[PDB]
Amino acid sequence: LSTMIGKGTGAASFDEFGNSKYQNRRTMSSSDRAMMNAFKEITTMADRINLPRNIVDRTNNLFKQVYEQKSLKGRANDAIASACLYIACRQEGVPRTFKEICAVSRISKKEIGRCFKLILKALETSVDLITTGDFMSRFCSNLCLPKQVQMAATHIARKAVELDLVPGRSPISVAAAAIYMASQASAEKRTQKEIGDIAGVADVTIRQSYRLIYPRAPDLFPTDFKFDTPVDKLPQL
Amino acid sequence: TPASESSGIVPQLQNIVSTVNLGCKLDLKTIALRARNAEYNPKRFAAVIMRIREPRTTALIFSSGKMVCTGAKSEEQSRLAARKYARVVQKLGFPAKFLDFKIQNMVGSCDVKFPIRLEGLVLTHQQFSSYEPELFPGLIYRMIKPRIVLLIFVSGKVVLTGAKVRAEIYEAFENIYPILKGFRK
Amino acid sequence: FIQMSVQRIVEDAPPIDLQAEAQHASGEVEEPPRYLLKFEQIYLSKPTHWERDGAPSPMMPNEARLRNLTYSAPLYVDITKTVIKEGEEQLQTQHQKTFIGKIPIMLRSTYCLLNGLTDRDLCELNECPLDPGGYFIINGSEKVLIA
Amino acid sequence: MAYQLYRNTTLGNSLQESLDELIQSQQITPQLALQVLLQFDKAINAALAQRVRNRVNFRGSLNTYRFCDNVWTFVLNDVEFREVTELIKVDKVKIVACD
Amino acid sequence: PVPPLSVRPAVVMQGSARNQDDLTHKLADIVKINNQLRRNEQNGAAAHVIA
Amino acid sequence: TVPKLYRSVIEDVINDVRDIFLDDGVDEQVLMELKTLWENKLMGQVEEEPLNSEDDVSDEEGQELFDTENVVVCQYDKIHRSKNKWKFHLKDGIMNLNGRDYIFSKAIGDAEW
Amino acid sequence: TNYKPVANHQYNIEYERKKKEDGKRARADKQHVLDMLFSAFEKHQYYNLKDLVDITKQPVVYLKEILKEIGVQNVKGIHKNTWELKPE
Amino acid sequence: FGVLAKIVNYMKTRHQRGDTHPLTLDEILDETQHLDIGLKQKQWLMTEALVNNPKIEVIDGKYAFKPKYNVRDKKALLRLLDQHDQRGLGGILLEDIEEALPNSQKAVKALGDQILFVNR
Amino acid sequence: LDLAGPLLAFLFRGMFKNLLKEVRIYAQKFIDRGKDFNLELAIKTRIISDGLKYSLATGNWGDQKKAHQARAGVSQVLNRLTFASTLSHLRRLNSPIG
Structure with a gap:
């Protein structure tokens, strides 16, 4: 619409007796x-x-x-x-x-x-349907995980959903369990509690999803990755 | 029909929602006080809750004299329950009527017993389907044939709702079944 | 200014308290609840950037100019909540560490990323070792303050 | 405020019957009897809170139920009261509950 | 008198007729409050608020 | 154990109404008489409503008339139900079962209808 | 930059409080509510309607419906209103 | 105080039932079951509360209904209205309905006699 | 001489107080309703973030609306013409005047 006014020049601007210099502005x-x-x-x-x-x-x-x-x-x-x-x-x-x-x-x-x-x-x-790839970045980055871990994580996530290993699960939980798997295979091991705290998912939700992917863990990693720990020596939860 | 002998399994009815109006003003407090096997919480709700043992149903009776009866697995049981409720109310000395007995909602379910591809189903029917794992673990399909709502799960289990007559369930199910078979893993 | 003054200012003396009104038209019992807020040590993280993805990463002044970013860093503060009501409770106190805003960094000061690096790292980062620094980068513009 | 319901008790009724005798003999007033009931109510409420410490777990069949004015009223049949060191089976029981 | 558009050049400056000059902004208050003052007076009005 | 509790209650009630009796000007003999009494006592139609074709929507007129119900008086903490499955969280209770006297500070139950 | 629950923890506390008994009100029994108005009239000649709903625990539309029936109203300054059971 | 407002509500209900006949304070307290409200409250009610109300109709040694002690003629003052130099009284329909009888029965004759209705 | 520090200390001070009032207004409106306080939800981070940033960019000093005309060239785009203009411009100092 329009303009507004304020102040007073500091000269006349009457409140005459009361304290209201000239006039107040108005809503529009x-x-x-x-x-x-x-x-x-x-x-x-x-x-x-x-x-x-x-x-x-x-x-x-x-x-x-x-x-x-x-x-x-x-x-x-x-x-x-x-x-x-x-x-x-x-x-x-x-x-x-x-x-x-x-x-x-x-x-x-x-x-x-x-x-x-x-x-x-x-x-x-x-709207478009969400995929696991859309969150993999933000999560691995906030946990200060090396680029290489993130790349594996993406692969593991991607491969797993392609294999239909998780028929009825949120893409977020699957992502979270993948990250956990990747991180526990990395030097920068992070607790379930930290990941759960970031993703919002319950740590028991991660526990189940990790338990379901664990039986095929060897086949899911990308060939370029170099283990810090053997998979025959990756702990269970 | 041939198209309904493959998925013929034909869905089973699990729940029906019906209403009936007694056509008279009622004192819920007195009713609730007198009646056995009944509950009334005026400080948290505005109506009295009643339950009969036969075919585990439950009815809700309002001050207006209108009531709603649920739980029957058949229209006969709905007519049976409504009448049984209207009877005990008659027995309360109030002019209970069976007037305006009507089915309002019907729920059906069935099992197709195969893994379902959901990304495709939502892709192919983005104008109808909606699947949001972040909200609810099960795709919601809003059909406009016999304007019906369906819940489709990865297990193969299927629930159907929004119907008032059985034919609409078979029709909604005969219609959707070929698509589901075609997305079979 | 960072090592002293921004600390001095939040470490001022305006701890705020708020007491909602109670026992309206009637009450008796015991509590018109009361809340107090206090501020503690201030933290400043080296100058970071968040992509539309949401993932933060370090910024470097050359990047900040090409893509027209603002070379600033995020500021955090410790806040306290302190429920000393009229009687029922007093100790329930909780410490937080919260993001309050982003302050521009002066270039090549100790809070810049450039402050420790030798001639080799700076040539590597694509910044000229001979550049005097000491000026802000704001939306891709070099902005110098005048005494 | 404590609940009047325990005045319904056999014990509470045994008290009221004792009071009615004293009223029949006109040695006290009805208003005073009512005042003794209030004190007994507070006393038995206080006694329950301070003295009683035992707990019982139970299972059974529900026969009928009521809920009105924040008061639950049930009648269960074939009930089984189990305490950590006791067992009581009963054909039927009336349960009145308010809080 | 309301200056014609040639006095109020519609400053444009890119936009889409975004330049509804500032004299126009002053005119839009004048009609607004005057429209409001005429309508206020058409009904009932306290002597001071019309003042 | 619990007869003792009733004894505790005897002491508390009698003592707390002594002063009240006193305030009425009544004699302590009446109070003692009260206690003694108390101790001794202690031990269209075709479509609009053809409902009569459904009569007997009940198995019994009532049960409380039989007095076959040992009585229980108690406060509740939580009442829950899941279909035929009911859950009870009861507290501060006085029981009387087959003439025997019982109490609980807390009681938790489950029941089917 | 904080974990995002399903709702604020305290919000859930607020939900729980709302979810404890109080919510619907006791519109039934006009006489006891009539008595409460009489009782209001026992302390002072006029009150704020905000106070009247607080002291009665009844819905506004209903408390108005009653106040239209047995009383009147009187406002002051800037829509500051008080109601009175017609003192005489 | 609150018992006097219960008396005024009963007297208002007596006119709504169809009657303005005077009663003693006793006959009011008996019907309303306030006879035992306490002799101090009955005395105050008699010698201050039915005295501080200037609208009470005192007739036949008794008190009657209730907002008007005079001019309850239940018809318009046409005679004053004849005098164009002093004619003046439109009022609110609610006072006239409160006075005695429903408007409609009188009004049928009045719609062709004197009355005009304004939605004010 | 008001350098970077005395000049910045001024600008940030006014903004943090402005932010302190905003948390007070927010906490007060909630507490009128009742019980659900969140501290993190209250802070309008933009007050500091945009406020320092706008002023360093335009040159306009102090907060907007009212007083601002006091100072205008407290900031400039750094003159990169030779090496000496940069060096000279970084060390230039100004007297406020008519």
Whole structure:
């Protein structure tokens, strides 16, 4: 719309008797002032996990579409905003887990997820299916694992899903157990608890997934890898 | 039909949801107080909960006089349960009616007994399928034939819901079965 | 400025406390809850960059200029929560180490990556050994402050 | 506030019957009897909290149930009360519960 | 008098008619508060708020 | 053991109503008479509602009239149910089984209907 | 930069509290609620509706429905309102 | 105090049932089962509470219903309204319905006599 | 002479206090509702992150809206013309004036 005013020159600017120099400013866009507040939350959240502005811009854009449709007006903006961040991140080929978006949002994992399915129907659109490769990077990097371990981990993950060794499992858990296997075969051994703490998965979820992949451990590693410990000497949990 | 003799196994009904209106205003407190095998929690809910032993069903009766009866594995048992409930209510000295007895939801299940490829199913039907391991371990298919919702699992197990008559289950299942067979590992 | 002043400022004297209102229209019992927040030692990590993937890695000033990044480092602080209510409890205290923001690093100061390296590493990193440093890199621009 | 329910007890009723005799003999007032019941209620509640220390685990068949005004009322049949060092089988039992 | 567009050159500067000059911004308040003052007065108004 | 507890209760109740009796101006003999008494006592239709074709949706009128129920009075901690499977977390309880006297500070149960 | 649970730990505490008895209210028995209003009128001539729902533990639409029936209202300054059981 | 508001609610219910006949305080306390509310409360009610209310109708040595002690004529003052230099009284329909009888029965005749309705 | 340190100390101080107020506003709104406090959720990291960053870039000193006109050339793009301009520019000092 328009302009604003403030200050006073420090000269006349009456409050005459009371203390109100000339006149206070006025609000102008209250009807949509909660769209701008949605954008403020989207940017804040986004910076907590340090996305580039390009993701944030698509997230901002997805919201404006959902808002104008008014089809989801009944739910909290912070729920709808959190879903936009989740959709936008997945469409841009760098998926984040619901556990991750919940951590930065004030909305619970359940409500972000429910909103997410509803928005997909709302925008009459669909999204790509996540794969294990999409998280392998972030996890191995945060645990200060050498590039070589990450490469093996990717291979192990990839090969395992190709072999259908894990019929009904989240790609995150499979990734987490693969990383654990790789790391326990590496010099930089990390505990189950640390990985579980990063991936969000329970350490028992890792324990099962590791138990299920362990019987075929020899066949899954890439030929280039050089063991620190023999596989006949890789511990069980 | 030939197409329904391969996956004929034909799905089994597990749950039915029906409603009936007694057509009269009722004192839930008195009802709840008098009735045996019944529960009423006014500080946490607004209706009385009732249960009969035969065919382990349960019914929920509202102050408006409307009630909902669930748990039957057949329409006959739903008609049987509704009548049994309406009887004990009659026995409460209240003008219970069997009026507006109707099936609201039906649930079916079956086992096709083979490993299913899910990435393809979601790929081939992205306008219908949705599979999110991060939310729920099982693909949700929203059919619009007999507008039905299906839960498809890796084990081969299948659940179907959103139906009010059995024909819709067979039709939804006859329709989806060829696709599932074609994605057989 | 880092070795003293940014510490001095959070180690100020404004520990904040907050007491929500209670016993509205009626109450009696015992607690209008009370919360206090305190700040401790401040930490500064060498200047890092996060890809859209989410994975952080070290930045180097030459990269920061070509891709137009800002050469800054992430800052963390110890925060305390301290529940000394009206009586029921007092010790329940918890320490945190939290990211609060990213401060620009002056080039070739002890907090730069360049500060320890010899002539060989700097030639290796693609930075000229003869470059005086001492100036910020902001969105790919060299920005120098004026006395 | 402690619950009046223990006033329903046989013991509590034995007390009330003793009080009604004293009332029949008009040696005390009904209001005073009510006041003795309140003290007995507090005393037996205090006694249960402070003195009683034993625990019992049980299994059985449920016959019928009720729930109203935060009070659960059951009637179980073929019940089996098991204590760490005891065993009690019973054909039927009425259980009233409030908290 | 409302200056015609030639006085308010629509500063453009890239955008998509993003340059709705700043004199236009001053005019948009004047019509807004005047539209509001006429409508305020059409109904009931406290003597000081209209003041 | 527990007759002792009732004795404990006898001491506590009698002592705590002594002063109250006193405040009413009643004599301690009445209080002693109370105790003695107490100790001695201690030991359309075709479619709208053709429901009558379903009568007997019950096996018995009631059970509490039989007085075959040893009584239990107790507080609950948790009540749970899973279909036919019920779970009970009870506490601070007074039992009377076949005339015998019992107590518990905590009781945990399971039952099927 | 913190592990992301299913929800805030405390949020779950908040859920648990909400999930303990309090939630629905006791709209039944108008007379006892009538008595409570009378009891309010025993302490002071007027109260804030925010206080009235707090002291009664009843839903606002209903407390209004009753206050329309037996009483009146009186506001002050900036929509600051108090209700009174018609003192006479 | 709260018992006086219960008395005023009973007297308001007596007019809603169809009656404005005067009763003693006793007959009110008996019907409302407040006869044993305490002699001190009955005395205060008699010698201060039914005295501090200026709207109570005192008639036949007794107290009657309730918001008007005068001008309960249950019809509009047409005579004042004839005088264009002093004609003045529109009011709220709720007071007129409160006064005696439902509007509709009187109104059928009145829609062709004197009344105008404004949705104010 | 206000060098890099006295100049930065000023800018960061104002921003950290601005951030301290933001945590207070957030914690206060929650506590009005009740029971679910999260410390990490409260901090708007952008206050420091963008605030130092914007000022070092534009040259505009102090926080925006009100006072800013006080100082304008406290920052400059480093003149890389010869080696001496860089060296000379890094060591240049300015008096504020009319």
